[PDB]
Symmetry: C2
Subunit: 487 residues, 2 copies
């Protein structure tokens, strides 16, 4: 040990960052749909679709900024400061005492009939998204740099708890903050995430006295020659183009991953959900985000075992040494989880034909089937097993494959390509929704899937996952053969 | 080249042997139900089960004969002689001139009113099964020995066409012979397989003059010490205990393979099958064995593609160099096909609730759904890909991982474990048919599956195949570390 404080200061900062991030996306659409905004509903989702995507587009630029100009520590501080400044807009816009400061005059009782005061909301969203795009891309390698000088095993062990803290913050936000947002006034529900950002900034500032940092280079990106004699830059360029095909092959995996996250909650909305006494009954309601945190909960239990049992056993028998094989195992478990979800949806669609039951979640009535929500546990357990394999291995591969001088940008680029997979999936959902294909044709999310063929969509996702698993296996073998032997 | 005749003489012998083998199992049950036997369905099906039991159980002993007493090449001839002697019984029984010679005089024209010619038919079954068991264990290593002195690539290339010939003989028998036994004179229907056996014996005898044989090693099995000197007999035991777990983990693969092979035909019986002009109409009928040969047809096209395109590309890229990895790839395609079959059956079971069309195949009415049989093409393209990946690789692994002295015995043990897997699959099918689990509860095979749940059975088979794929991948790494690392 000895560097436990430097790891703790990064883990707590990441946890608070994740709590703040899920404090916004969980109920951004519902907050924009009501009281002083009253957007019709189509642009309320557009704001979220722009924020998620500004989170990805600005990640390589933040990585380049923290490698050429800033030292990846001052860059994290600057990103958290802009991130903190953009948080205050939501609590200031939810409180009537300060609403008139950012907006001219809006005191509508309820939505009566362009979009009121947009510039403040869009500025806050832009700053928050650019802060998130930089914080992830820089803190993911920065945290691993503390235990970097102990071999890849220490880095993998650190990334295990890094993802564990990411998921614990997500649960603390989706369960606690989102419940306060939905029932208690929006003011507290948007003041808590701002407090979390402030605490994360304070923790990073306090802990940067034990952090092991590195100075910016500033002459590593200007030497990206593509006209072909300098040395020590060639193998930095060669190792950068060598990993581009690996990142590209991960795009279908990201597509399937994000589409499953999108559709699993929608399917869970149409299952029988038990009511927790006087927590979801009159006059409160069950927050929708509570159905989103099913992946994370199983992760809080899987990662410890995976760090105490699975990893030691695999290392003892020399099984799965490289991260690219762990990614393939995660992709296979993703395919299994998609097939299980399709099997469950096939049974669920045959039950909404006899009888349905109305249930209220987000003050929206859903015609669920007489099938317990806990029948969806097997697919969530499979996807959690996949994420503790694929998600952690992808981060550690993006860490260990990047050049030393070009380290945050490559990790940023990784987070960019994930975003590329997020929007390709949304295009896939709009491709099966055309009149030619009846799959998922009942409008947007949080609607009604009793007339949708979600099981066929799940089977298609599983088939795509299998094909991209084979392609990724081929590319990972062609990468490992060159890396281990030729390099 | 140079040894092209020694390979053709074995390929033609295997083709004729396979044609004779499928000339029996294709219509043995229907033959025992009518004319001289008039057996009940239970005992007629038990006869086929006993025949399979002799085919699988006696293979290791047939291999031990070829290594300890006979010279393999002589063992194949001795087994083929008994095989031919046991084949004449069926044509003799079907012929009215010789039926009285076989047992007494039976004229149960309508089966108005406990086995007739039980000793004759049981001896014919036993000798035929023992001959098949001895041929299979000794024809594959003897065939591969002709090109053994050119490297593993030559052995794999020979096994490709060996499996191609196995499938071509199966198509020639199931398509040609089974049509003759079902619609036209039946005495020639069993006379053709006997002629095939006689031709195979003559071909092997003629090709014995170019065959590269090996001398028997009598003192090879007596050195199986299990208490713990000489040398090179320890290695033969070290390389025998080390391959047992691979076969043990392949047992569930054979389970899934055989159950999936039977249930695919069972489901194909309940799909809309086009009538082929005046070949299946009055007064003839579509042979059921044709619906069994649809897989083998897909094999006659994939092997030429694999031998000329897939194999060179994989070889010139360092992809899939070992047989165990190819077995794993085939096992993955098996669970993909099982999932595809479950998806198709889920749609087929929804259609039979509205409309069912009657069709006649085995002179028996089936209430098929209004869905073309060609929708089975995808699920058959995958098991076609698996067999050209898993079936060939398993044979080449059993050939290459066996000690030089003990080759036929190990090959026979491979088929014995395949039969063990087949019987475990039969037990599994009998397990889901209990009152507690409603899956596949409508009596025996070749019946009505519209009240069954075959999609659930397919999904369970897919899950079992995935689990055994993971297990086989775990053990295959623990075995390949003793091939060129420890050894």
């Amino acid at each position: 040990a000895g560097r436990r404080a430097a790891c703790g200061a990064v883990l707590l900062t990441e946890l608070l960052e994740r709590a703040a991030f899920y404090g916004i996306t969980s109920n951004l659409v519902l907050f924009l749909n009501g009281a002083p905004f009253c957007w019709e509903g189509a642009q309320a989702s557009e704001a979220l679709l722009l924020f998620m995507g500004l989170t990805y587009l600005g990640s390589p630029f933040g990585g380049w900024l923290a490698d050429a100009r800033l030292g990846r520590a001052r860059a994290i501080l600057l990103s958290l400061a802009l991130y903190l400044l953009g948080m205050l807009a939501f609590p200031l816009l939810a409180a009537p005492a300060t609403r008139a400061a950012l907006c001219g005059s809006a005191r509508l009782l309820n939505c009566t009939a362009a979009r009121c005061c947009s510039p403040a909301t869009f500025a806050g969203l832009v700053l928050v998204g650019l802060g998130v795009a930089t914080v992830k891309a820089n803190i993911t390698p920065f945290g691993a740099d503390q235990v970097k000088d102990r071999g890849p095993e220490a880095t993998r062990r650190f990334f295990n708890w890094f993802y564990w803290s990411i998921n614990l913050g997500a649960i603390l936000s989706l369960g606690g903050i989102a419940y306060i947002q939905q029932n208690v006034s929006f003011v507290t529900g948007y003041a808590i995430p701002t407090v979390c950002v402030g605490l994360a900034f304070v923790v990073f500032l306090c802990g940067q006295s034990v952090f092991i940092t590195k100075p910016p280079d500033g002459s590593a990106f200007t030497d990206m020659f593509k006209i072909l004699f300098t040395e020590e830059k060639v193998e930095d360029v060669k190792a950068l183009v060598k990993i581009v095909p690996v990142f590209l092959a991960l795009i279908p995996y990201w597509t399937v991953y994000f589409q499953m996250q999108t559709t699993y909650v929608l399917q869970s909305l149409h299952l029988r959900i038990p009511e927790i006494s006087n927590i979801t009954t009159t006059p409160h309601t069950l927050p929708a985000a509570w159905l989103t945190m099913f992946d994370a909960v199983l992760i809080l239990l899987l990662i410890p075992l995976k760090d105490k049992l699975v990893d030691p056993i695999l290392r003892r028998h020399g099984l799965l040494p490289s991260s690219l094989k762990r990614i393939a195992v995660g992709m296979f478990f993703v395919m299994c989880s998609a097939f299980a979800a399709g099997i469950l949806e096939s049974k669920r669609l045959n039950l909404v034909k006899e009888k349905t039951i109305n249930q209220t979640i987000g003050n929206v009535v859903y015609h669920a089937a007489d099938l317990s929500l806990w029948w969806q546990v097997p697919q969530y357990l499979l996807i959690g097993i996949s994420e503790i394999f694929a998600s952690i291995a992808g981060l550690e591969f993006a860490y260990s494959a990047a050049p030393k001088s070009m380290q945050s940008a490559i990790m940023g680029l990784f987070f960019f390509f994930s975003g590329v997979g997020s929007f390709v999936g949304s295009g896939l959902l709009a491709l099966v929704s055309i009149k030619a294909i009846g799959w998922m044709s009942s409008h947007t999310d949080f609607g009604n899937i009793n007339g949708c063929y979600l099981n066929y969509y799940f089977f298609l996702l599983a088939a795509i996952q299998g094909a991209t698993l084979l392609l990724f296996l081929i590319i990972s073998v062609k990468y490992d053969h060159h890396r281990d032997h030729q390099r």
